């Protein structure tokens, strides 16, 4: 089918340490190449590829527009930040932890264990394993932070072993939505 | 720690465009260009804040305008197709006779035009299927979503049908409960 032409525009607000540090980064992109951008840390527009040239020299000319794009750190970035602070930054939902085996087998013939945290937000999460109270940093192959798009995460941290009877495995999970790390144990 | 993104776009010849806000990768809200109304991701967000949809409508008018310019100055060089990556997934470890939801995560693709269709045993569906506008990524490609709810079984086999212009043939992704 026909050729496509695209124009993407992004206004970015990098918030470091809550609001104590902000950095606005206006970016102009054509197709998939950023042609011109503004940076609070530089104060003015600057080209990034020959096509950007006209633009940069341009805008920076209107010291009037520039003055605005520089204050935008307080009227836009900062202002917006506290608009949705409650349902975004503060957003917190306690995960759901569960344990089960992948391919039920005849005990002691090397297996794999998969903790399936699900329900998340925020993302920053931890989930260690503990065979009989002993932590293992050996055999915990993980899928990684999986974002679902409905504002909820779900990671799967697996562990490979060999089911000796009596052994009691456990998946621990610390989340900012819980004052005390959640836990779940499974008998071998 | 946190990043908000006022990302938007206009595409030709599709003459389609979009405007939405983003908080750390999660759409906060977007404007329904046609209905000219702001659409909050999670209905909750609206009982709290707001957004004059009328504003996005105007920003885009300019974007359209900027594309025309750039397209010309760039001497009509067009976008290079970039095939997405689909990865069917689920909301939570499927439990027989226990509700779930099949996700179809379209990712790393551009331009912003992709067809998706849900197949249950080969056949099409409309069982509470919704999607997400084109989400932004750091490399400027796009990341999309598609959800289909469903009550598990062994009496069923599902599939995510994804058509894009970088693909040489539709992209099929099968999902089926294993026992």
């Amino acid at each position: 089918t026909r050729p496509r032409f695209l124009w993407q525009l992004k206004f970015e607000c990098h918030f470091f340490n809550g609001t104590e540090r902000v950095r606005l980064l206006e970016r102009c992109i054509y197709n998939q190449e950023e042609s011109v951008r503004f940076d609070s840390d530089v104060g003015e527009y600057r080209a990034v590829t020959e096509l950007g040239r006209p633009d940069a020299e341009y805008w920076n000319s209107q010291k009037d527009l520039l003055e605005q794009r520089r204050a935008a750190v307080d009227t836009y970035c900062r202002h917006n930040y506290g608009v949705g602070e409650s349902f975004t930054v503060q957003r917190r939902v306690e995960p759901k932890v569960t344990v089960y085996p992948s391919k039920t087998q005849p005990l002691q013939h090397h297996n794999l264990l998969v903790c399936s945290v699900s329900g998340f937000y925020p993302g920053s999460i931890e989930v260690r394993w503990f065979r009989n109270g002993q932590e293992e940093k050996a055999g915990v192959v993980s899928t990684g932070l999986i974002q679902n798009g409905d504002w909820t995460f779900q990671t799967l941290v697996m562990l490979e072993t060999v089911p000796r009877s009596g052994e009691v495995y456990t998946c621990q999970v610390e989340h900012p939505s819980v004052t005390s790390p959640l836990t779940v144990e499974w008998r071998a | 720690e946190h990043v908000i993104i006022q990302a938007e776009f206009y595409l030709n010849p599709d003459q389609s465009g979009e405007f939405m806000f983003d908080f750390d990768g999660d759409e906060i809200f977007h404007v329904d260009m046609a209905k000219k109304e702001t659409v909050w991701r999670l209905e909750e967000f609206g009982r709290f804040a707001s957004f004059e949809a009328q504003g996005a409508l105007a920003n885009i008018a300019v974007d359209k305008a900027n594309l025309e310019i750039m397209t010309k100055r760039s001497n009509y060089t067009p976008i290079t197709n970039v095939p997405p990556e689909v990865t069917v997934l689920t909301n939570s470890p499927v439990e027989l006779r226990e509700p779930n939801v099949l996700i179809c995560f379209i990712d790393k693709f551009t331009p912003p035009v992709v067809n998706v269709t849900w197949l249950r045993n080969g056949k099409p569906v409309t069982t509470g299927v919704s999607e997400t506008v084109f989400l932004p990524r750091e490399d400027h490609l796009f990341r999309k979503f598609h959800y289909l709810p469903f009550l598990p079984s062994t009496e069923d086999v599902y599939d995510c049908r994804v058509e894009h212009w970088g693909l040489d043939e539709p992209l099929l992704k099968h999902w089926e409960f294993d026992a």
Binding site: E26, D55, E57, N80, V83 | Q6, F29, A49, N59
Partner: peptide
């Protein structure tokens, strides 16, 4: 709490 958009500018003609 009103969300404020950032107006897009016209490129160099």
């Amino acid at each position: 709490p009103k969300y404020v958009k950032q107006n897009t500018l016209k490129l160099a003609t």
